[PDB]
Amino acid sequence: HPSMRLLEPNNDEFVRSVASPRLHHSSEALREVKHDVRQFQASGDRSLQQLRDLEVALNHWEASQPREFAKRGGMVAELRTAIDAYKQQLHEQ
Ligand code: NA
Secondary structure, three states, rough: OHHHHHHOOOOOHHHOOOOOOOOOOOOOHHHHHHHHHHHHHOOOOOOOHHHHHHHHHHHHHHHHHHHHHHHHHHHHHHHHHHHHHHHHHHHOO
């Protein structure tokens, strides 16, 4: 599944997609999402507990920062699809 490239450890497409070139500050909710993407990557995609945290952190961002989410969240569906694929792979062992 090509969504999986988004949490391949070297991949920066998701964090680029939530950057503001006009240099608007990221919410704490968005900074926790970006940090959780990098933490999952750091192990080479081995932690289901970290992957869960990323999924919860995306829900918190969507709930708490609607305007930032709607504006910066264009790659969220694809990242959530990648999360599910790595969940399947870790469930399979
Ligand atoms: Na989800």
